Write a protein that binds this ligand. Structure first.
Ligand SMILES: [Mg+2]
Ligand SMILES: [Mg+2]
Ligand SMILES: [Mg+2]
Ligand SMILES: [Mg+2]
Ligand SMILES: [Mg+2]
Ligand SMILES: [Mg+2]
Ligand SMILES: [Mg+2]
Ligand SMILES: [Mg+2]
Ligand SMILES: [Mg+2]
Ligand SMILES: [Mg+2]
Ligand SMILES: [Mg+2]
Ligand SMILES: [Mg+2]
Ligand SMILES: [Mg+2]
Ligand SMILES: [Mg+2]
Ligand SMILES: [Mg+2]
Ligand SMILES: [Mg+2]
Ligand SMILES: [Mg+2]
Ligand SMILES: [Mg+2]
Ligand SMILES: [Mg+2]
Ligand SMILES: [Mg+2]
Ligand SMILES: [Mg+2]
Ligand SMILES: [Mg+2]
Ligand SMILES: [Mg+2]
Ligand SMILES: [Mg+2]
Ligand SMILES: [Mg+2]
Ligand SMILES: [Mg+2]
Ligand SMILES: [Mg+2]
Ligand SMILES: [Mg+2]
Ligand SMILES: [Mg+2]
Ligand SMILES: [Mg+2]
Ligand SMILES: [Mg+2]
Ligand SMILES: [Mg+2]
Ligand SMILES: [Mg+2]
Ligand SMILES: [Mg+2]
Ligand SMILES: [Mg+2]
Ligand SMILES: [Mg+2]
Ligand SMILES: [Mg+2]
Ligand SMILES: [Mg+2]
Ligand SMILES: [Mg+2]
Lengths: 64, 149, 204
RNA sequence: GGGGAUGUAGCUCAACUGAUAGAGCACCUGAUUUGCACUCAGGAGGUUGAGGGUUUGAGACCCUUCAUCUCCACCA
RNA sequence: AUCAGGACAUUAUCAUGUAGAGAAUAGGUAGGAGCAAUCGAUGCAAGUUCGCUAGGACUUGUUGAUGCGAAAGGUGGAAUACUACCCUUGGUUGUGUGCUGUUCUAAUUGGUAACUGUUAUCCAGUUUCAAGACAGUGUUAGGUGGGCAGUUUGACUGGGG
RNA sequence: GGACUGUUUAACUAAAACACAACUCUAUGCCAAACCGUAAGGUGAUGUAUAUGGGGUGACACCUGCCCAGUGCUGGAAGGU
RNA sequence: UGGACCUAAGCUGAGGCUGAAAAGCGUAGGCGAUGGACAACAGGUUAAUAUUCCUGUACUUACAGUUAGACUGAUGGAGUG
RNA sequence: GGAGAUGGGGAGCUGUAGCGAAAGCGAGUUUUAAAAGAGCGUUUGUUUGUUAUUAUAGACCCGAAACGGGUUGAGCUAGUCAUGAGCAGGUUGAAGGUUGAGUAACAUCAACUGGAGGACCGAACCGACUCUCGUUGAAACGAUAGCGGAUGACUUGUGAUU
RNA sequence: CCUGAGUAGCUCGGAAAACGUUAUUUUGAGUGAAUCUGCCCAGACCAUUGGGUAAGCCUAAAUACUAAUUAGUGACCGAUA
RNA sequence: GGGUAGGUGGUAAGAACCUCAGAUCCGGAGAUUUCCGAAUGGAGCAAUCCGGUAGUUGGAAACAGCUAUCAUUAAUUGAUGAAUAAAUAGUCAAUUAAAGCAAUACGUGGUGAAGUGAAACAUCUCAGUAGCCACAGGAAAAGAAAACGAAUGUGAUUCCGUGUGUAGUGGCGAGCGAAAGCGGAACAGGCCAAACUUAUCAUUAGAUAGGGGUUGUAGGGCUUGCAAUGUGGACUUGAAAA
């Protein structure tokens, strides 16, 4: 599914309000961007993750 | 964001320094190439206290790099004979990492980011030149021979 | 929803955020939680009332009461004639199981209450199953004969030990009283009257 | 409902930022051919959109309006 | 990462500037008395704008004593040594980012080829080739969009239209 | 009238209707255009412009005239919004 | 005649990919005849069965013992099918 | 407390002072410079039982064509795919080839062979153009008599699939 | 010295609360703090006053329902109910 | 165990038996429990077909009886091990759990319409209802203030009445409609992280296992003393009683 693998945060369903306040259901998708990390002997394994976790990954020194 | 760098780089800094470089060149180029390091001891004042150990850590990794240079300089026996038509068809088809199928594990590691060889990796049937850079001052010259099995 | 592999993700970070929230290290605390809660008290500086509050717990616990029942009994006694600091003492000591324990045929007050609820207990103008009826100073409480048919007998002995405000004859299973317990028979475990004024604020 | 800019020969336009209005076209005349145009040059055609304010010096700078335009806004 | 250029936009300096008049091409304003002069003048030499070929100016050396008539004639709203600050523009170094044409690879992409898991057209890993900070994807904002959906399309009327 | 052989409204219309070989225009250089899905995946096609998809006309023979004002499509410097 | 033999269209499909969820796609494997391979014919009999029961004459595939000869040769390659 | 009448429970609700948008004033208050004028007030309650009407619920009953959401259907039929089967019988006699003539050599002609055709006639088979009958029928679409195709863009069995 | 940071805030689209999006709560995209003389709140917002300690976890009771077991009840039905 | 003099289930008579060494019958505890079905050795058109492995008994073997076992996923452990030296991917084995169903009922979460009303209709309502899906539990959810809110104020959550059809919110239309306060049912508050410290990891620990701590009239840690050995729980095993 279109979801992060580090966390479990997925899509957010909401309304597409326009002029005249017409209601149409729309979907916000999370920023799944490929990322490689070093875990368990630095083993790199491509993992589709949200940009938020990527920023979290960058500051936490893991990403090097 | 703040990054300390290890080796000598044409821009930014020389040996120790603190540079504010974008993460693209830092997290993708400077870090995997051991040209830089993240926040030392996780802060700035922590970095200042640990620099009195970072100097000697840089000395000893340079020292082991010199040890790595002697090990490759004592053998120069990385041999490979190609299987081809031979007379009109001469070219090394080992790419580059087949030669590293004879360095890492069997002998001195000689990592993929360490050997600054050209993109032709040798295409001759005679003695050639391998250049490897442990640091920004040491130049490695290897002479491998080639031929037909 | 797949091979979540908690090892793969947990080790993947080693600190992050989710691991530490979840950190299997999570112990049991299955006794720390219960016991300390249990029941507390002490006196403080800013509200004063701390002493009053703690005394209520002790007083309520001495008879095994839930706070709601206490509010009912206080409401009843509050309105009558006047300075009733002699009435509510009789009301609080008029519990049937309290009288049964103070009568001396049970090792402990709660055991007497259990007995009462289990139908050991015979009264005068009535009979009794519920261990909460408010009794009148001069009433008799003839004990059943089935209970003596189950000789554990150890009880009768406690009965004679007694305290002066109760007059009960051993073996013969009979009891009454007069001259309701004075404050001496209500020892210094809980002897104060400003918790009483507190209940007028909390209970109208 | 604001914000900006424009207004000059009849027309199309320079605007001659104050030390005192000009060009092409419209029109008159002259030259100009066998004729028609074409062509060349003079003259005529200006109260500077209007009013007010300031300097010794404003069509020109300030204020106020008029008309036009482009923008935005523009759920009674 | 990066090369330059231009975008996001326009960066820093003094010269320079004729309304006429006025030894003056005055764009200014005041201030300020005497000033150049080894706190060495002068002049030509020559670089240059410029032409109302006058003037703006000068630079440097010439150099060894002329000076400064832009002290002081001089007219001017405008000015007459000297001190400041007052501006368009030639001049000063910039262009950080993106972009605009570029180069590079490590992000990323591949329905190039090879090996392995593996007796396996998928998938995964490792390469190789081709791209490459593009593309694709997410969020935001314009344009087109009966492909699709929800609705509207009045009343009187010698029937209705 | 349709070139023809054929196809069509099971259960009121078999025809001049549809289709057909053929003509022309348009898009598409391959991870092609187009299409099903939300996407993966797949058809196109294990094909490669002598190929594929779409619009129109409908053997064969001779012809197909004028208009680019409006609309549609393609391209375009700068300029205005 | 069909299974214990084999595959076509197609179905299912560990891993895996994709997708708010349910699920969709799909590899290796497994199913799936309307096809391929495989040894029995004639006559008689009961009210009802007969290449099945009976008579007559045959054929095929396994296992063990035995005799003689021979080195045996597939989960793979090739031909045929 | 008996699945009770009821007792406790005054939390609250209505009335007791109104006027003004409101702060605010008060038997007065709002407007207004105003006290004048005008508007509103300067009193008649509450809780139940019964009846009538009314508001929210489907609200006196029956009736739509519809709309949205979920499942079941390609055993009929339409298309596609896989594997099989069928077209009695009788005619016409193409391309091509061989030979001979002919041509400078072609072209062309004659004979023989060959058996092609979205070829012809006509049964099974497929389809349904016409008259009549039937129309609560034998039949929720047929019967008799004719009719078109009938080696193909054919007909059909089984299996799968949209 | 320690007191929970891609966190609280802020911007762009949505929502929860009675509220048709707004002080408070939440989040798809982007950015991003401080550390008890600290931070949040008292319907925009600022100052004073006051209240409370976010970004960690668990929590009985009163509350919702009856397919079933036992006992029982009905100004409920009595074969078109 | 209770309890008897009858019993062999109904349409059901008869035939034939059992039963006073205590039958039939009722209650508690056990035994057996074919096949399909989550179905799980493989398949498959459900109640069918085809097996493997390790034993054991007959046979001269094929074979045939009689037993036990053989699905997948996840976690742990161990062995083996690619591209490619190491190492993983992968492979194998063992152990432990998960699958499914139903109570036409309650809970949480995700997704989520339309008929209808507004006398049309698009904002809105219907309605976060129906439906679809996931996870339970015997209830679930919620929960201990970075709170209410205007005061010499209350002091987790939940449920009932009132506050009121009030303040408000609405093409200000149809409509929608609390939060305080008050009266009641019940009542309970606990525990980690960080400081500081101990032991161990090529101690590059930034990791593991312990002591210390859980806050607002700020709490805790650092150093130094007094008083304490208790009271109470949402708590384990037992024994006894009702
Ligand atoms: Mg709606
Ligand atoms: Mg593909
Ligand atoms: Mg990009
Ligand atoms: Mg858009
Ligand atoms: Mg439209
Ligand atoms: Mg429409
Ligand atoms: Mg509607
Ligand atoms: Mg009408
Ligand atoms: Mg009419
Ligand atoms: Mg025809
Ligand atoms: Mg026909
Ligand atoms: Mg018909
Ligand atoms: Mg017909
Ligand atoms: Mg695709
Ligand atoms: Mg293909
Ligand atoms: Mg074609
Ligand atoms: Mg046509
Ligand atoms: Mg035609
Ligand atoms: Mg044109
Ligand atoms: Mg165009
Ligand atoms: Mg089979
Ligand atoms: Mg068959
Ligand atoms: Mg027969
Ligand atoms: Mg009452
Ligand atoms: Mg009056
Ligand atoms: Mg009355
Ligand atoms: Mg069909
Ligand atoms: Mg023929
Ligand atoms: Mg024919
Ligand atoms: Mg805030
Ligand atoms: Mg709402
Ligand atoms: Mg504070
Ligand atoms: Mg805190
Ligand atoms: Mg009935
Ligand atoms: Mg009847
Ligand atoms: Mg017995
Ligand atoms: Mg509607
Ligand atoms: Mg309506
Ligand atoms: Mg719970």
């Amino acid at each position: 599914a279109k979801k992060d693998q580090l966390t479990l945060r997925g899509p957010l369903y909401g309304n597409n309000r326009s002029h005249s306040k017409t209601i149409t259901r729309r979907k916000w998708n999370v920023n799944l961007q490929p990322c490689k990390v070093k875990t368990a002997d630095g083993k790199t394994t491509r993992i589709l993750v949200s940009t938020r976790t990527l920023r979290t990954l960058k500051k936490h020194n893991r990403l090097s | 964001m703040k990054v300390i760098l290890k080796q000598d780089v044409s821009n930014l800094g020389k040996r120790f320094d603190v540079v504010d470089v974008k993460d693209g060149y830092a997290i993708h180029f400077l870090f995997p190439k051991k040209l830089a390091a993240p926040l030392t001891k996780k802060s700035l004042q922590d970095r200042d206290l640990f620099l009195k150990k970072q100097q000697e850590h840089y000395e000893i990794n340079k020292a082991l790099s010199h040890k790595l240079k002697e090990v490759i300089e004592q053998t120069e026996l990385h041999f490979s004979l190609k299987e081809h038509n031979g007379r009109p068809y001469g070219s090394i088809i080992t790419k580059q990492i087949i030669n590293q199928a004879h360095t890492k594990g069997m002998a001195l590691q000689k990592f993929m980011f360490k050997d600054n060889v050209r993109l032709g990796f040798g295409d001759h049937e005679i003695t050639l030149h391998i250049f490897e850079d442990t640091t920004a001052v040491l130049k490695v010259k290897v002479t491998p021979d080639n031929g037909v099995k | 929803k797949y091979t979540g592999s908690i090892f793969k993700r947990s080790r993947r970070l080693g600190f992050s955020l989710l691991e530490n929230n979840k950190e299997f290290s999570k112990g049991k605390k299955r006794k720390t939680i219960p016991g300390q809660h249990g029941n507390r008290f002490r006196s403080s500086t800013m509200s004063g009332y701390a002493q009053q509050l703690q005394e209520k717990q002790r007083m309520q616990y001495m008879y095994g009461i839930t706070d709601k029942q206490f509010r009912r009994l206080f409401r009843l006694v509050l309105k009558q004639r006047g300075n009733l600091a002699v009435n509510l003492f009789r009301v609080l000591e008029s519990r049937l199981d309290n009288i049964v324990y103070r009568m001396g045929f049970a090792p402990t007050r709660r055991s007497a209450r259990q007995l009462v609820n289990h139908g050991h207990v015979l009264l005068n103008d009535r009979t009794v199953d519920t261990p909460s009826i408010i009794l009148n100073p001069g009433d008799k409480v003839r004990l059943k004969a089935k209970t003596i048919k189950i000789p554990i007998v150890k009880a009768a002995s406690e009965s004679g030990v007694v305290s002066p405000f109760v007059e009960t004859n051993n073996k013969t299973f009979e009891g009454t009283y007069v001259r309701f317990p004075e404050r001496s028979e209500l020892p210094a475990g809980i002897n104060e009257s400003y918790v009483v004024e507190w209940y007028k604020r909390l209970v109208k």
